[PDB]
Design a protein that fits this description.
heterodimer, A: alpha+beta, two-stranded antiparallel ribbon, B: rod-shaped, binds zinc ion, Histone-lysine N-methyltransferase ASHH2 (chain A)
Amino acid sequence: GSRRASVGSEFTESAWVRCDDCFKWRRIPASVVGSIDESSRWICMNNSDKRFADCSKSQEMSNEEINEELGIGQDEADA
Amino acid sequence: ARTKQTARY
Ligand SMILES: [Zn+2]
């Protein structure tokens, strides 16, 4: 199910979002992170940026580079 | 959609 495990806190300034059809990441304004709930199925095909708007496209920072910028245990899921 | 937000201004 798309209500994937764990959660953070707040909306704050500009954020990331995960694809619920794979697991790839995209940088978004906080106006989208306030619209997307845990139940909201955000995916690559819906992505704002047509350069990255597929499960087959790339991302702004690889999962082991982004999770280090936040300083967190993301991608450890393997799923 | 499990995610987070960067501590980088
Ligand atoms: Zn995807």
